[PDB]
Amino acid sequence: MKVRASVKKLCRNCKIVKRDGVIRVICSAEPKHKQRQG
Amino acid sequence: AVYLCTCGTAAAKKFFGQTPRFDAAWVTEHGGVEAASKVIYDTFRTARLDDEVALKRDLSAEIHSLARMGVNDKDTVVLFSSETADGQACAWAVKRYLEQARPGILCRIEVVAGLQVTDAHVFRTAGVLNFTKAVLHEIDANGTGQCVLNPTGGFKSLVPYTVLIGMLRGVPAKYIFEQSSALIPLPMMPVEFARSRLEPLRPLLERIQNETAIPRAELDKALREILDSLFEDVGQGQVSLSPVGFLIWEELERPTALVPFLSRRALDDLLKMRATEGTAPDDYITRVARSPEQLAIGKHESWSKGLFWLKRGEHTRDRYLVSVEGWRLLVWRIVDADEYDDLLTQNRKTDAGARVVAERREKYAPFVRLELYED
Amino acid sequence: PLLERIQNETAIPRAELDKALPSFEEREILDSLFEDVGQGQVSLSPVGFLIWEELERPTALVPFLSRRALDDLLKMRATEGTAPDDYITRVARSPEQLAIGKHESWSKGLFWLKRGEHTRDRYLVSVEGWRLLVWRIVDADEYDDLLTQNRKTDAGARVVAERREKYAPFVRLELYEDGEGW
Amino acid sequence: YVKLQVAAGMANPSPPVGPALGQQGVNIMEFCKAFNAKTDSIEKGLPIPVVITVYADRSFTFVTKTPPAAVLLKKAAGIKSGSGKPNKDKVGKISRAQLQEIAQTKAADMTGADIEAMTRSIEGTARSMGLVVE
Amino acid sequence: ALNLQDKQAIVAEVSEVAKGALSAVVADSRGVTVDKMTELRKAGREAGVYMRVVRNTLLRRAVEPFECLKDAFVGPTLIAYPGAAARLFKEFAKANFEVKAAAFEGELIPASQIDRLATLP
RNA sequence: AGCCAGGAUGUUGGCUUAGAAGCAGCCAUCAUUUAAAGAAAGCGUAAUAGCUCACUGGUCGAGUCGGCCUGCGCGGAAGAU
RNA sequence: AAAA
Ligand SMILES: [Mg+2]
Ligand SMILES: [Zn+2]
């Protein structure tokens, strides 16, 4: 998991979700694309 | 793929040490080659192909190696069985087990005539030659890019002439010891036939290639016992090429790479064109020389005594006068258009190539190889 | 040319090797001999070193001829026959023989080789890298004059001054005179 | 189930066709002889496209087609290779009848409902290779 | 996709064809590849059978003496525009795709009873 | 939006290349049957093959899409008694 | 399959 200040959609299957006040990116096709804003 | 498996009588291993040892008599007594196949096939009819212990104890060498090479349904296996009865009995046993364990396979047996090891004069003359024909037939009927020589079964004397075929043609060879468990792709050192030794024989084979027969005595008078195997007696007082001979004839016929050379007149002319044209001509000649396809394309008007012109392309400042000797690409002249035009202007009237070769020693020779250390 | 470089210089760039083999089949057949050594280079694999050390005689220096030497060698063929060719190759083969021949040394790394007393030919050679460059080939009479000029003024610098105008490029000492092909 | 453009009669067991059929399992020399016997009538030196149909029993049948339009356009213009930069470099010239001649033979492999429609496909084929129509 | 003008163009053209035709057959064409449709396209042109695929909403607008044929449009729809069209469809459908309805004499023809038009000389 | 189906032909466009077949690189990017189907957006193959998207036809039965201007908040945010 |  990447922890960056700027989180973005890396491909077409990335999704932006907010969970417990944190913007997260979850990708169904690529585990390298999972990132969390912090 | 195709597996050209040499077949050896390791299948009938179960009759080891029992009173009638597994010899051509033993096959004979039990009924014959076909009848004995069933007896041999019975002893290992049950063992699998995925079971390691049966591969190393309970199966022949062909079955163990083939199962290791990854024999599948869409395959074709050839068994070069020996001429002896005990050899052929096992061949008909391996095939039945292979066609059983992998249904949908195509195994066919070639009986290499005169492959016995109890006589010398026959084996030197009819064994290896017939075996050389049979292998070279299958490779040429399936392409070099699809055959896998399997020199593990059979005698230890065929193996030199299986691998040597693989080196020349290109097919690999794979071997596996009984107690080992790793397939070994044997090294393939790049080899070929000695051109220097074989060059004087070129006119000799030329007769045979045309008239398809030569009287034996004239062959002997024309021509060092190694050269004997190159020739097979047809039998009516003539001699024609043995299967080894056809390899040599094709080797002495295939085009090869060429190393450029420059006559003393070309070296004076190349330099004065280098200043105006960079180092373009140096690469072109080397590029053309080391590529037979490029050479055959560029042949402009062909002159006598084997001379033929080359040119870089349309509207270029150089056209070469080259000819071939051995593996060398002799370069005679390197001229621009106007000199080129006048030469062809002259050649319209009379012969031209005769006048150039006439003064070979005084003006052109010696030819110096094209390696330069400009600095 | 490439193998001789690889034997002396440890490795060559692959791009140089690729240019040498245009045909795809040639590279496929000769793939085993070469081996990648790193930094975009290739070197002879131990299989290759066996073949090369079998089809090629050992050497220490590869002879080369300047243009002026080439004419000098050709004109002397009527007197000394092929002796200059053999003496050059022998000198280039064995450094021990090359050390014996040095008699007078000029500037910029040029020295004169004389095969000994009672002989007529004499050579003006220098060693660059692993190549034995040959600049001139003179007789007994001219050799004295070339020593007189160097005696007064620098003559080694005069020759190297005219390097790109009379001497280079250096061809390699491989000739072909008789009509015969292997 | 493979599609090839083997030569007119030069059906060697060579790498151009050799390894292709091997993965299926059909006899290489069997197909080579069968293909040549029917393509002898074909004009010399043509990459006539043939679609191979292999079965489970390691048997095969094949159907031959008309020569490709690009091949027909190359011989019509009297050339050997197309333009390196089509629509930038022009490397030939063919009349509309030459378009009709090529369309008619390829009509056995076309899909248009008229000679004009079949020609326009050949016309589009000609532009894509740099061969202008003259 | 399609604007009102382009849909209006479709409605008029199929209305003109439906006006100048004699018989209509409605068929299903879901699950059949383009190559088999290509064969039908050549067959339809050889027998002079107009053939097209249009939206059911657009089809029902234009088709209003085929109103009895404007009663089953739910699912994929194909339409062709005497006789020998139902004959062509039955042979292909049996050998490959199905038929839904046929139009003739300004009357509906049920799917089971298209044997009449498939046999008429 | 989801769900069902199609997603083709000239043709393997030409050049290059051992191979370059939509998908290493360059140029062009037309045409046909078309409800619709890029001389192909992505994956894949040694190259083919195979998968998906663009595009369109069905099922469904009220809204839906992205930009702009603006108020207040969110993360970026770790220190020593 | 270290004299098939
Ligand atoms: Mg803030
Ligand atoms: Zn992603």
Q: Which residues of D touch E45 (CB under 8 A)?
A: 113
Of D24, D49, D65, the residue at which a domain comes to its end is D65
- Identity of the residue in B170, B199, B372 whose CB atom sits nearest the CB atom of C171: B372
CA dist., res. B128 & res. B3, Å (int): 19
* Residues 6+ positions from B31 with CB-CB distance below 8 Å: none
CA dist., res. D89 & res. D130, Å (int): 6
Phi, psi of D51 (to 5 degrees): -105, 115
Domain that holds residue D78: 66-134
Q: Which residue has the tokens 């912090």?
A: A38
Is residue B27 a contact partner of residue B89, using CB atoms and an 8 Å limit? yes
Quick one: CA dihedral D11, D16, D19, D20, positive or negative?
negative
CA dist., res. E103 & res. E114, Å (int): 10
Encoded tokens for C36: 């990648």
CA dist., res. C106 & res. C157, Å (int): 9
Is residue B208 a contact partner of residue B240, using CB atoms and an 8 Å limit? yes
Neighbours of D5 (CB within 10 A): 15
Separate counts of helices (H) and strands (E) for chain B:
17, 14
Encoded tokens for B72: 């599948």
Of D65, D81, D97, the residue at which a domain comes to its end is D65
Pairing of strands B259-262, B328-335: parallel
| Touching partners of A (3+ C-beta pairs < 8 Å) | none
Phi, psi of D17 (to 5 degrees): -125, -25
Which listed ligand is nearest to A31 at the C-alpha?
Answer: 2
**Helix crossing, C67-80 with C83-93: angle to 10°?**
120
CA dist., res. E99 & res. E28, Å (int): 6
For residue D86, what are the CA distances in angstroms to D70, D89, D120, E27? 13, 6, 17, 45
DSSP single-letter state for residue B173: B
Distance A3 CA to F81 C1' (A): 34
Residue type, E46: E
CA dist., res. B190 & res. C119, Å (int): 47
Question: Residues D75, D132: one domain?
Answer: yes
Q: Which residue has the tokens 């990854």?
A: B70
Question: Residues D101, D48: one domain?
Answer: no
Encoded tokens for E5: 């003008």
DSSP single-letter state for residue A20: T
- Identity of the residue in B75, B104, B143 whose CB atom sits nearest the CB atom of D28: B143
Show the CA angle centred on residue B136, arms to residues B130 and B139, nearest 5°: 145
DSSP single-letter state for residue B113: T
B162: part of which helix (H) or strand (E)?
helix B159-169
CA dist., res. C97 & res. C99, Å (int): 5
* Residues 6+ positions from B113 with CB-CB distance below 8 Å: B83, B126, B130
CA atoms within 13 A on the CB side of D113: 11
Distance E64 CA to F35 C1' (A): 21
DSSP single-letter state for residue B291: -
Is residue E108 a contact partner of residue E101, using CB atoms and an 8 Å limit? yes
As a whole number of Å, the end-to-end CA separation of chain E is: 43
Domain containing residue D71: CATH number: 1.10.10.250
If DSSP codes are grouped into helix, strand and coil, which group holds residue C139? coil
CA dist., res. C40 & res. C11, Å (int): 10
CA dist., res. B115 & res. C7, Å (int): 46
Domain containing residue D20: CATH number: 3.30.1550.10
Pairing of strands D93-94, D132-133: parallel
Task: Report CA B334 to chain centroid distance, whole Å.
Answer: 38
Encoded tokens for E37: 């449709």
CA dist., res. C8 & res. B42, Å (int): 64
Strand G closer than 7 A to residue B318 Cβ: no
Burial annotation B51-71 (CB, 10 A radius, 16+ → b, else e): eeebbeebbbbbbbbbbbbeb
Neighbours of E40 (CB within 10 A): 21
Q: Round the CA-based radius of gyration of chain A to a whole number and report it.
A: 9
Question: Residues D100, D119: one domain?
Answer: yes
Which of D51, D109, D111 to probe by mutation at the E interface, max E CB count within 10 Å? D111
Phi, psi of E20 (to 5 degrees): -90, 10
CA dist., res. B212 & res. B347, Å (int): 40
CA-closest candidate to residue D122, choices D91, D95, D89, D100: D100
Task: Report CA A23 to chain centroid distance, whole Å.
Answer: 7
Neighbours of A5 (CB within 10 A): 6
Which listed ligand is nearest to A26 at the C-alpha?
Answer: 2
Cβ <8 Å between D22 and B1? yes
Distance D83 CA to F11 C1' (A): 17
B106: part of which helix (H) or strand (E)?
strand B106-111
Largest CA distance in chain C: 61
For residue A20, what are the CA distances in angstroms to A8, A16, B110, C121, D112? 18, 13, 77, 97, 63
Burial annotation C72-108 (CB, 10 A radius, 16+ → b, else e): bbeebeeebeeebeebbbebbbeeeebeebeeeebee
Question: Residues D76, D131: one domain?
Answer: yes
Q: Which residues of D touch B104 (CB under 8 A)?
A: 58
DSSP single-letter state for residue C109: G
Ligand 1 mean position to A18 CA, how many Å? Answer: 17
Structural domains for chain E = 1-121 (3.30.70.1730)
Of D13, D45, D65, the residue at which a domain comes to its end is D65
CA-closest candidate to residue C148, choices C104, C98, C100, C108: C104
Residues 221-260 of B with CB under 7 A from strand G: none
Distance A12 CA to F75 C1' (A): 24
Which listed ligand is nearest to A12 at the C-alpha?
Answer: 2
Q: Which residues of C touch B361 (CB under 8 A)?
A: 177
Cis geometry, peptide bond prior to residue C169 (ω within 30 degrees of 0): yes
B57: part of which helix (H) or strand (E)?
helix B52-57
Residue nearest to nucleotide F55 (CA to C1'): E1
CA dist., res. B337 & res. B318, Å (int): 7
DSSP single-letter state for residue B306: G
- Identity of the residue in B1, B104, B141 whose CB atom sits nearest the CB atom of D13: B141
Q: Which residue has the tokens 């096959």?
A: B27
Experimental technique used to determine this entry: cryo-EM
Show the CA angle centred on residue C32, arms to residues C26 and C38, nearest 5°: 105
Q: Which residues of C touch B372 (CB under 8 A)?
A: 169-171
As a whole number of Å, the end-to-end CA separation of chain D is: 40
Cis geometry, peptide bond prior to residue B366 (ω within 30 degrees of 0): yes
Residues 60-79 of D with CB under 7 A from strand F: 66, 68-70, 74
Q: Round the CA-based radius of gyration of chain B to a whole number and report it.
A: 29
Question: Residues D6, D44: one domain?
Answer: yes
* Residues 6+ positions from C22 with CB-CB distance below 8 Å: B287, B290, B291
CA dist., res. C97 & res. E98, Å (int): 99
Burial annotation D60-92 (CB, 10 A radius, 16+ → b, else e): bebeeebbbbbbbbbebbeeeebbeebeeeebb
* Residues 6+ positions from D59 with CB-CB distance below 8 Å: D26
If DSSP codes are grouped into helix, strand and coil, which group holds residue B375? coil
Neighbours of E22 (CB within 10 A): 11
Q: Which residue has the tokens 């039945």?
A: B96
Q: Do chains D and A touch (3 or more CB pairs under 8 A)?
A: no
Pairing of strands B2-6, B147-150: parallel
Cβ <8 Å between D111 and E38? yes
CA-closest candidate to residue B242, choices B136, B329, B364, B343: B136
Q: CB pairs under 8 A, 24+ apart, for B123-126?
A: B123/B157, B124/B229
Cβ <8 Å between E45 and D113? yes
Covered bases, chain F (protein CB within 7 Å): 4-18, 21, 26-37, 39, 46-48, 55-60, 74-77
Largest CA distance in chain B: 93
For residue B47, what are the CA distances in angstroms to A18, B15, B182, C151, D119? 62, 17, 21, 95, 66
State the DSSP string of C45-89. -HHHHHHHHHHS---S-EEEE-HHHHHHHHHHHHHHTTHHHHHHH
- Asked if D108 has any chain E CB less than 8 Å from its own CB, the reply is no
Distance E58 CA to F63 C1' (A): 22
Distance D86 CA to F28 C1' (A): 5
Residues 28-87 of B with CB under 7 A from strand G: 55-57, 59-61, 64-65, 82, 84, 86-87
Nearest chain D Cα to E40, which residue? D111
Residue nearest to nucleotide F59 (CA to C1'): E75
B108: part of which helix (H) or strand (E)?
strand B106-111
CA dist., res. B41 & res. B12, Å (int): 8
DSSP single-letter state for residue A8: -
Is residue E114 a contact partner of residue E100, using CB atoms and an 8 Å limit? no
For residue B294, what are the CA distances in angstroms to B248, B284, D71? 25, 10, 23
State the DSSP string of E9-72. HHHHHHHHHHHS-S-EEEEE-TT--HHHHHHHHHHHHHTT--EE---HHHHHHHT---GGGTT-
Distance B148 CA to F18 C1' (A): 21
Which listed ligand is nearest to A28 at the C-alpha?
Answer: 2
B214: part of which helix (H) or strand (E)?
strand B214-215
Residue B23 burial (10 A CB sphere; 0-12, 13-18, 19+) = middle
Which positions 29-88 of B are in contact with D (Cβ < 8 Å)? 74-76
- Asked if B104 has any chain D CB less than 8 Å from its own CB, the reply is yes
CA atoms within 13 A on the CB side of B74: 15
Encoded tokens for B115: 């492959």
Is residue A33 a contact partner of residue A11, using CB atoms and an 8 Å limit? yes
Count the domains in chain D.
2
Is residue B28 a contact partner of residue B56, using CB atoms and an 8 Å limit? no
- Identity of the residue in D13, D14, D25 whose CB atom sits nearest the CB atom of B74: D25
Is residue B27 a contact partner of residue B33, using CB atoms and an 8 Å limit? yes
Tell me the nt nearest to B54, Cα to C1'.
G1
Which region holds residue B203: left if phi is over 0, alpha if psi is between -120 and 50, else beta? alpha
Pairing of strands B2-6, A35-37: unpaired
Q: CB pairs under 8 A, 24+ apart, for B28-37?
A: B28/B85, B33/B85, B33/B88, B33/B89, B33/B92, B34/B92, B36/B85, B36/B89, B37/B89, B37/B90, B37/B91, B37/B92, B37/B93, B37/B96
Question: Residues D60, D70: one domain?
Answer: no
- Identity of the residue in D18, D29, D58 whose CB atom sits nearest the CB atom of B146: D18
Q: What is the 3-state secondary structure (H, E, C) of chain D?
A: CCEECCCCCCCCCCCCCHHHHHCCCCCHHHHHHHHHHHHCCCCCCCCCCEEEEECCCCCEEEEECCCCHHHHHHHHCCCCCCCCCCCCCCCCEECHHHHHHHHHHHCCCCCCCCHHHHHHHHHHHHHHCCCEEC
Question: Residues D111, D47: one domain?
Answer: no
Is residue B107 a contact partner of residue B99, using CB atoms and an 8 Å limit? yes
Question: Residues D4, D59: one domain?
Answer: yes
CA dist., res. C109 & res. B319, Å (int): 40
Question: Residues D6, D32: one domain?
Answer: yes
Neighbours of C164 (CB within 10 A): 11
Is residue E59 a contact partner of residue E101, using CB atoms and an 8 Å limit? no
Cβ <8 Å between C169 and B199? no
Question: Residues D123, D97: one domain?
Answer: yes
Cβ <8 Å between E45 and D111? no
- Identity of the residue in B75, B106, B143 whose CB atom sits nearest the CB atom of D18: B143
Largest CA distance in chain A: 24
Question: Residues D16, D74: one domain?
Answer: no
Nearest chain B Cα to D16, which residue? B143
Strand F closer than 7 A to residue D115 Cβ: no
Question: Residues D28, D82: one domain?
Answer: no
* Residues 6+ positions from E104 with CB-CB distance below 8 Å: E22, E23, E82, E117
